[PDB]
Design an enzyme around this catalytic site. Structure first.
Site, mmCIF file in Angstrom:
data_model
loop_
_atom_site.group_PDB
_atom_site.id
_atom_site.type_symbol
_atom_site.label_atom_id
_atom_site.label_comp_id
_atom_site.label_asym_id
_atom_site.label_seq_id
_atom_site.Cartn_x
_atom_site.Cartn_y
_atom_site.Cartn_z
ATOM 1 N N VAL A 1 10.600 0.503 -2.182
ATOM 2 C CA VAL A 1 11.770 -0.366 -2.139
ATOM 3 C C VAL A 1 12.025 -0.955 -3.515
ATOM 4 O O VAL A 1 12.935 -1.758 -3.694
ATOM 5 C CB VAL A 1 11.601 -1.486 -1.100
ATOM 6 C CG1 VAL A 1 10.497 -2.438 -1.515
ATOM 7 C CG2 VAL A 1 12.905 -2.240 -0.908
ATOM 8 N N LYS A 2 11.215 -0.553 -4.485
ATOM 9 C CA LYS A 2 11.328 -1.034 -5.848
ATOM 10 C C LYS A 2 11.981 0.022 -6.728
ATOM 11 O O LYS A 2 12.936 -0.317 -7.470
ATOM 12 C CB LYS A 2 9.943 -1.391 -6.370
ATOM 13 C CG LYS A 2 9.821 -2.886 -6.646
ATOM 14 C CD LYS A 2 10.001 -3.710 -5.373
ATOM 15 C CE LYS A 2 8.675 -3.790 -4.629
ATOM 16 N NZ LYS A 2 7.876 -4.824 -5.252
ATOM 17 N N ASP A 3 12.871 0.803 -6.129
ATOM 18 C CA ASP A 3 13.592 1.843 -6.840
ATOM 19 C C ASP A 3 15.051 1.450 -6.979
ATOM 20 O O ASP A 3 15.789 2.033 -7.768
ATOM 21 C CB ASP A 3 13.467 3.176 -6.109
ATOM 22 C CG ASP A 3 12.561 4.154 -6.825
ATOM 23 O OD1 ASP A 3 12.360 4.008 -8.049
ATOM 24 O OD2 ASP A 3 12.044 5.074 -6.159
#
Ligand code: HEM
Ligand code: HEM
Lengths: 507, 507, 135
Positions: free
Chosen positions: A77-79
């Protein structure tokens, strides 16, 4: 000189202010073309999957939905924030091609930044705490990014904390930039522009409660601001591992342990971005429940999600007791299982850290679990030297009815095993002459087991090898100064034999 | 009794017959609901991503496109066939809920079927060759499906081959079924219905070539048939690792090394479903180029794809030489990197297998790579016992003008390190009173290095643990019968010091 | 001097018998090892060839402590020291010992000091290194 990540928020935003006041460059969601020029465009449009068995197993009247955020390009979710930060830095002109990007990150943002840098040609340097799993290290080495580590428990403001190391690196290397995932307003803005819109547009503008895990704070703040602007009825909750001080009121925080196994969530300081004012409640999540719920998700819904998702759903099953029929609960599952293969996904590690006790592992297993391997009808009367010719084995075996025999040298060292059917098939295919020695066809791999071990151990062995050789070893002394040793095979056993024994005993 | 997987294809289809004559039930693609009722609906619609660098690196004139099939629920291109097989078996009534499925597979279909069983409630047993990576084993065990292994080098029709052990287990256990990914007509039909219509629709049917490695054979058959029925102008190219007999004409298979390292492609028998009449050309592909191209893909494009993707691109870079500007090529990337974390992704394993050679590794590294750590200005004039109080350290380090000092017990065993600024932050935070010992704030982990090692070894060490301590050993003897040993910390080196030295030497 | 091939994996007490050093040096491939007391004070040097020559001459016995054969005097050097300083030192003494100095505090009032040996160097090693660099 150095600017801390703990500085108070300077944004003037407050609920109800019109969107026209934004000094930030908002971007409407982009329509992904039929073929997309670079993998970086495969970020967003993630699917929302309804959980089916966790809801009923824990008395959830409401519909429970999960925002599977781990199907992005980099698997996290850190993209979203990495791509958004790169885009903003390029649009503002701060970044030129060939520059060096340093980022203090808990792995997940590191993979996204490394992927973006490799695609766009930047040089990337990643600083991440020591406790991060080695899978992230391997993926970052493959992606060409250069890694630097920092001690597990260094205080955030210390000279050798990951933020501090990143700062001094930026002040040492020329022509480098720290995007500062903690303070850069692009971090929460990415979610506020893309994630929140997708969440509200999939559920169709209504939902009762949102559960989220809080690391850098962008995930929860960015979603919550948009939700409270567009759907105020939502109850925003946050999760936080026991040991980090994000949660309020301060009473929830009171505990001593500072190092926790769950990766990517919780910090020893309040990030600048995190807007705790739009959080209506908080819960603290331990590690045992987090990993147990991650395993339960994998094993009962097929969501290959990591530990942080376990913590999220573990908190959700508690917070959502308040809801009733027709209501809807949302959980954010940050990252994929890919980064935890050697961790909780492995039973050995779970036992080593003690998050799962032996009774929990053994009590649910079938009845025959504790029977020794001795209870089997093991037998192997004959063995053949490796030098024997193929035809010799064919005749000698079919004369006595057997079809497989261990291969042992004169010294008693076992070499492997040979199966009559395989030699017959090879002869029919002509892959070996009848005069050829068995060494060409012997199976050179197997696992060695003892009589005392239970059938559970045998089953956990057969998941790695086909042939398990029950053997024995004898020490042969001469004078207590001259000694010797030898071993011997008892009888082969395979999953077929174990299953047949189970069927025979149970029937 | 046993139906062999090599039985000739009984299908009557030939290029040109109208599809209305098909006796199989075709399923048209449809838009899944805005929220997926269960994870399995997140299969298909995977993205087509353009390849930029690899194409030009070898001078390919044509535009090169890839079909990233590793974003499926199970992270592979074998989640389409698993879902299709389960659906068809249920529709034809062969399988009832609660039945047991046993399937011989090369992992990927194993993972897909285990996921489907876990979601829909079936007992699943997976039979796979012993050589496959333990990552698949871990993912399967987490999913609860039982596992059985078979020897890697057993002939396909031997008693203990995977397709044989599957048959014996099916005959043994009652109410059990084999969906037979090799023979079943659902396997190719899945791709023929979903994949081909996705491919020729994404690029608008104007493509000239296709490459797709060959395992069971569905991957290429199901796509080539539809492509020829819709656009015969497109060539179809297969691929196969050296050591398998799928490629034709037969002379291409003339090699003696049986085992190969790439996982899941190439078989010692022709699968019944493999329709070789629609494969216009063939190539072989050893393991070295396969893994080299996989690493090149990961590093230069960000497609976190597995070995078979490398084996396919290594062939597409040869075959596509014949095309010119304007034409379009398509490759099929089967699986994700998740299955090979400890395999080719690990430089150590690549060197161990000899695929990488030290010359190719070192020649890319900067100048300072081969210098000895001895060249650094390392030093460590002082040290402290673990019992010293925090205030004593705070005052003494400033007295001596240092900021960090090794912590070693009187016996010489090194415990770790401690730094001034971290102690200051701890005192400010109250975690330690000045009277408290440094045992609380010591960094209890580090990695041990020796003066002889090259800076490359140091750089590889610094990726795992922050502190590399340059220890030395002197063994003290008394009579050649009594011996003693001790070590001391000559100097401490960190990434910051290494970068400082590199910059100073370079400037 | 930090750039030389200095090394000293092992060392012995002066009380060790001559035969024990004779056997150990050849057992582990060395020809000269430092002789150091239990407390770590460096006494000097001992050489295998000198022990053999003295045994042949009959001046010592295998049971005799190496303390008889040790080269009891030498000079001391440090890493930071340039090769010029090493050459100047060698003008007066045969053996130049690369050593280390450390302080092991306990309470900032209580303190202790100890030392150890990096390696050995002589005119032979210096000239060998000079030739190796020159070529
Ligand atoms: C809607 C009206 C908004 C207004 C009037 C506003 C105002 C501002 C201004 C003037 C700044 C610059 C402060 C500085 O440079 O020191 C700022 C920064 C920032 N804004 Fe906004 N903003 C708005 C929307 C948002 C939204 C929607 C978000 C996130 C969802 C957000 C998060 C932030 C953050 C994290 C910063 C950086 C704070 C810092 O660096 O300390 N803002 N805001
Ligand atoms: C005009 C269209 C088609 C016709 C008339 C046709 C005809 C048939 C028939 C009669 C069978 C049964 C053979 C038996 O029971 O022994 C069969 C099976 C089969 N068909 Fe087709 N088919 C058509 C389309 C397709 C397509 C589109 C595919 C794949 C993309 C396909 C692949 C297969 C396969 C793999 C089998 C199983 C053969 C075996 O298990 O031995 N067919 N087909």
């Amino acid at each position: 000189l150095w600017i801390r990540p703990d500085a108070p928020s300077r944004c003037t935003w407050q609920l109800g202010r019109p969107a026209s006041e934004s000094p930030h460059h908002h971007t409407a969601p982009a329509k992904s073309p039929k073929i997309l020029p670079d993998i970086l465009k495969k970020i967003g449009d993630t699917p929302m999957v309804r959980i089916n068995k966790i809801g009923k197993k824990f008395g959830l009247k409401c519909e429970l939905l999960a925002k599977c955020e781990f199907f992005n390009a980099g698997g996290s979710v850190k993209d979203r924030i990495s791509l958004r930060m790169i885009e903003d830095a390029e649009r503002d002109g701060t970044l030129k091609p060939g520059d060096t990007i340093i980022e203090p990150t808990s792995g997940n943002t590191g993979i996204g930044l490394a992927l973006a840098a490799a695609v766009r040609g930047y040089r990337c340097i990643i600083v991440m705490p020591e406790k991060m799993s080695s899978e992230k290290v391997d993926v970052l080495r493959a992606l060409g990014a250069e890694i630097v580590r920092t001690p597990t428990n260094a205080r955030f403001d210390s000279p050798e904390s990951h933020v501090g190391v990143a700062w001094r690196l930026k002040n040492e290397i020329p022509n480098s930039h720290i995007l500062d995932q903690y303070r850069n307003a692009s971090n929460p803005l990415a979610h506020y522009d893309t994630t929140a819109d997708e969440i509200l547009q999939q559920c169709d503008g209504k939902l009762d409660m949102l559960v989220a895990s809080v690391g850098t704070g962008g995930t929860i703040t960015g979603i919550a601001r948009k939700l409270k602007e567009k759907c105020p009825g939502c109850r925003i909750i946050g999760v936080d591992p026991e040991g980090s001080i994000l949660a309020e009121p301060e009473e929830l925080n009171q505990t001593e342990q500072t190092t926790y196994e769950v990766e990517g969530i919780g910090y020893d300081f309040i990030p600048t971005v995190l807007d705790r004012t739009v959080v209506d409640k908080w819960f603290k999540s331990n590690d045992e429940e987090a990993f147990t719920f991650a395993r339960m998700l994998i094993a009962q819904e097929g969501l290959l999600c990591g530990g942080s998702a376990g913590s999220t759903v573990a908190v959700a099953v508690k917070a959502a007791q308040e809801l009733q029929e027709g209501q809807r609960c949302v959980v954010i599952l940050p990252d994929s299982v890919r980064n935890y293969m050697t961790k909780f996904l492995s039973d050995r590690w779970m036992l080593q850290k003690g998050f799962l006790k032996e009774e929990d592992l053994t009590e649910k297993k079938p009845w025959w679990w504790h029977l020794r391997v001795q209870e089997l009808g093991l037998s192997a009367p004959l063995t053949v030297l490796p030098t024997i010719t193929c035809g010799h084995t064919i005749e000698i075996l079919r004369e006595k009815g057997f079809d497989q025999a261990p291969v042992v040298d004169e010294a008693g060292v076992i070499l492997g095993m040979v199966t009559l059917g395989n030699m017959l098939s090879s002869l029919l295919a002509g892959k070996v002459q009848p005069s050829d020695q068995v060494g060409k066809v012997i199976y050179k791999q197997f696992k060695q087991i003892r009589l005392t071990d239970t059938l559970g151990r045998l089953s956990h062995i057969l998941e790695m090898d086909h042939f398990a050789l029950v053997v024995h070893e004898q020490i042969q002394y001469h004078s207590t100064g001259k000694s010797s040793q030898r071993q011997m095979v008892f009888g082969v056993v395979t999953a077929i034999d174990l299953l047949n024994f189970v069927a025979a005993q149970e029937r």
